[PDB]
A = this chain, B = another copy of it.
Amino acid sequence: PAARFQVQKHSWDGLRSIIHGSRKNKAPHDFQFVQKTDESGPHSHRLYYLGMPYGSRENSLLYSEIPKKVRKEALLLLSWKQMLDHFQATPHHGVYSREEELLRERKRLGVFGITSYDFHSESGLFLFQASNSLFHCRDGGKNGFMVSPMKPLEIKTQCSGPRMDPKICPADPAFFSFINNSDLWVANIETGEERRLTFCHQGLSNVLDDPKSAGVATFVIQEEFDRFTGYWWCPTASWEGSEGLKTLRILYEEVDESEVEVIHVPSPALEERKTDSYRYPRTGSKNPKIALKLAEFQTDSQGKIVSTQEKELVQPFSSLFPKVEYIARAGWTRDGKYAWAMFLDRPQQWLQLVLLPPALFIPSTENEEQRLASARAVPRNVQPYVVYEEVTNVWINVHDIFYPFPQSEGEDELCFLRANECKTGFCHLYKVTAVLKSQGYDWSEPFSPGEDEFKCPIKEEIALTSGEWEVLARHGSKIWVNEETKLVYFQGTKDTPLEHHLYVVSYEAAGEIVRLTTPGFSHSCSMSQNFDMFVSHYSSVSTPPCVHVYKLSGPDDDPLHKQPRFWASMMEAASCPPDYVPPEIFHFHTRSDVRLYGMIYKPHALQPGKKHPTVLFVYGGPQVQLVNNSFKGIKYLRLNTLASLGYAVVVIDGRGSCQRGLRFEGALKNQMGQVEIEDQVEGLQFVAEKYGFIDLSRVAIHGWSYGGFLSLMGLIHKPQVFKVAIAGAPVTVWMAYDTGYTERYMDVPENNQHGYEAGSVALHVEKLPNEPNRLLILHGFLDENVHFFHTNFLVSQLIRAGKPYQLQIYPNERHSIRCPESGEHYEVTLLHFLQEYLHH
Which residue on chain B has the smallest CB distance to residue A773? B836
Q: In the complex, how many angstroms separate the beta carbon of A789 from the nearest chain B beta carbon?
A: 5
A373 located at the interface, meaning its Cβ lies under 8 Å from any Cβ of chain B in the complex: no
Residue of A204, A795, A799, A836 ringed by the most chain B CB atoms within 10 A: A799
B270→A792 contact, CB < 8 A? yes
- Inside 8 A of A832's CB, which chain B residues have their CB? 772, 804
- Inside 8 A of A812's CB, which chain B residues have their CB? 796
A770 and B807 in contact, given A787-B273, A802-B828, A812-B796 (Cβ under 8 angstroms): no
A793→B807 contact, CB < 8 A? no
Q: In the complex, how many angstroms separate the beta carbon of A773 from the nearest chain B beta carbon?
A: 9
Question: CB-defined interface of A264-288 with B at 8 Å, one 1/0 digit per residue?
Answer: 1010001111110000100000000
- Inside 8 A of A770's CB, which chain B residues have their CB? 11-13
B12→A772 contact, CB < 8 A? yes
- Inside 8 A of A792's CB, which chain B residues have their CB? 270, 781, 809, 811
- Inside 8 A of A771's CB, which chain B residues have their CB? 11-12
A274 and B263 in contact, given A12-B804, A799-B821, A811-B793 (Cβ under 8 angstroms): yes
In the complex the two chains form, what is the Cα distance from A810 to B799 in whole Å? 8
Residues of A271-329 at the interface with B, using a CB-CB cut-off of 8 Å, are 271-275, 280
A808 located at the interface, meaning its Cβ lies under 8 Å from any Cβ of chain B in the complex: yes
Question: CB-defined interface of A482-498 with B at 8 Å, one 1/0 digit per residue?
Answer: 00000000000000000
A561 located at the interface, meaning its Cβ lies under 8 Å from any Cβ of chain B in the complex: no
A796→B808 contact, CB < 8 A? no
Residues of A165-193 at the interface with B, using a CB-CB cut-off of 8 Å, are none
Residues of A397-417 at the interface with B, using a CB-CB cut-off of 8 Å, are none
A623 located at the interface, meaning its Cβ lies under 8 Å from any Cβ of chain B in the complex: no
Q: In the complex, how many angstroms separate the beta carbon of A637 from the nearest chain B beta carbon?
A: 18
A822 located at the interface, meaning its Cβ lies under 8 Å from any Cβ of chain B in the complex: yes
Question: CB-defined interface of A192-213 with B at 8 Å, one 1/0 digit per residue?
Answer: 0000000000001110110000
- Inside 8 A of A266's CB, which chain B residues have their CB? 264
A829 located at the interface, meaning its Cβ lies under 8 Å from any Cβ of chain B in the complex: yes
A802→B16 contact, CB < 8 A? yes
Question: CB-defined interface of A791-834 with B at 8 Å, one 1/0 digit per residue?
Answer: 01101100110101011111110000000011011001100100
B802→A824 contact, CB < 8 A? yes
- Inside 8 A of A109's CB, which chain B residues have their CB? none
A799 and B772 in contact, given A264-B273, A273-B789, A274-B263 (Cβ under 8 angstroms): no
Q: In the complex, how many angstroms separate the beta carbon of A260 from the nearest chain B beta carbon?
A: 13
- Inside 8 A of A280's CB, which chain B residues have their CB? 273
A796 and B811 in contact, given A206-B205, A274-B262, A802-B16 (Cβ under 8 angstroms): yes
A contact residues, total (Cβ < 8 Å): 50
Q: In the complex, how many angstroms separate the beta carbon of A769 from the nearest chain B beta carbon?
A: 9
In the complex the two chains form, what is the Cα distance from A144 to B13 in whole Å? 78
Question: CB-defined interface of A1-39 with B at 8 Å, one 1/0 digit per residue?
Answer: 000000000011100100000000000000000000000
Which residue on chain B has the smallest CB distance to residue A825? B799
A263→B273 contact, CB < 8 A? yes
Q: In the complex, how many angstroms separate the beta carbon of A353 from the nearest chain B beta carbon?
A: 36
- Inside 8 A of A736's CB, which chain B residues have their CB? 271, 273
In the complex the two chains form, what is the Cα distance from A180 to B248 in whole Å? 55
Residues of A12-68 at the interface with B, using a CB-CB cut-off of 8 Å, are 12-13, 16
- Inside 8 A of A271's CB, which chain B residues have their CB? 736, 789, 793
- Inside 8 A of A275's CB, which chain B residues have their CB? 264, 275
B825→A809 contact, CB < 8 A? no
A270 and B799 in contact, given A206-B205, A275-B275, A771-B12 (Cβ under 8 angstroms): no
- Inside 8 A of A12's CB, which chain B residues have their CB? 770-772, 804
Q: In the complex, how many angstroms separate the beta carbon of A827 from the nearest chain B beta carbon?
A: 11
- Inside 8 A of A13's CB, which chain B residues have their CB? 770, 802
Q: Which of B205, B209, B789, B828 interacts with A270 by CB under 8 Å?
A: B789
In the complex the two chains form, what is the Cα distance from A264 to B824 in whole Å? 30
In the complex the two chains form, what is the Cα distance from A809 to B807 in whole Å? 9
Which residue on chain B has the smallest CB distance to residue A819? B799
B807→A808 contact, CB < 8 A? yes
In the complex the two chains form, what is the Cα distance from A525 to B274 in whole Å? 45
- Inside 8 A of A11's CB, which chain B residues have their CB? 770-771
Q: In the complex, how many angstroms separate the beta carbon of A538 from the nearest chain B beta carbon?
A: 36
Which residue on chain B has the smallest CB distance to residue A282? B273
Q: In the complex, how many angstroms separate the beta carbon of A791 from the nearest chain B beta carbon?
A: 8
- Inside 8 A of A828's CB, which chain B residues have their CB? 802, 804
Which residue on chain B has the smallest CB distance to residue A824? B802
Question: CB-defined interface of A748-790 with B at 8 Å, one 1/0 digit per residue?
Answer: 0000000000000000000000111000000001000001010
Q: In the complex, how many angstroms separate the beta carbon of A507 from the nearest chain B beta carbon?
A: 49
- Inside 8 A of A206's CB, which chain B residues have their CB? 204-206
In the complex the two chains form, what is the Cα distance from A795 to B806 in whole Å? 14
- Inside 8 A of A204's CB, which chain B residues have their CB? 205-206
Which residue on chain B has the smallest CB distance to residue A19? B802
Which residue on chain B has the smallest CB distance to residue A809? B795
- Inside 8 A of A274's CB, which chain B residues have their CB? 262-264
In the complex the two chains form, what is the Cα distance from A796 to B268 in whole Å? 12
A795→B807 contact, CB < 8 A? no
Q: In the complex, how many angstroms separate the beta carbon of A181 from the nearest chain B beta carbon?
A: 16
Residue of A12, A262, A812 ringed by the most chain B CB atoms within 10 A: A12
In the complex the two chains form, what is the Cα distance from A173 to B584 in whole Å? 87
- Inside 8 A of A262's CB, which chain B residues have their CB? 274
- Inside 8 A of A825's CB, which chain B residues have their CB? 799, 802
In the complex the two chains form, what is the Cα distance from A263 to B792 in whole Å? 20
In the complex the two chains form, what is the Cα distance from A795 to B772 in whole Å? 22
In the complex the two chains form, what is the Cα distance from A822 to B736 in whole Å? 23
In the complex the two chains form, what is the Cα distance from A352 to B24 in whole Å? 64
Q: In the complex, how many angstroms separate the beta carbon of A211 from the nearest chain B beta carbon?
A: 13
- Inside 8 A of A799's CB, which chain B residues have their CB? 810-811, 821-822, 825
In the complex the two chains form, what is the Cα distance from A244 to B266 in whole Å? 59
In the assembled complex, 12 residue pairs joining A and B whose CB atoms fall closer than 8 Å, in A order, are A12-B770, A12-B804, A13-B770, A16-B802, A205-B205, A263-B272, A263-B274, A264-B275, A273-B280, A273-B787, A795-B811, A799-B825
Task: List A residues at the B interface (Cβ < 8 Å).
Answer: 11-13, 16, 204-206, 208-209, 262-264, 266, 270-275, 280, 736, 770-772, 781, 787, 789, 792-793, 795-796, 799-800, 802, 804, 806-812, 821-822, 824-825, 828-829, 832, 836
19 more A-B residue pairs beyond the given contacts A799-B825, A802-B821, with a C-beta to C-beta distance below 8 A = A11-B770, A12-B771, A12-B772, A16-B802, A204-B205, A205-B206, A205-B208, A205-B209, A263-B272, A263-B274, A271-B789, A273-B736, A273-B787, A273-B789, A781-B792, A792-B811, A795-B809, A796-B811, A806-B806
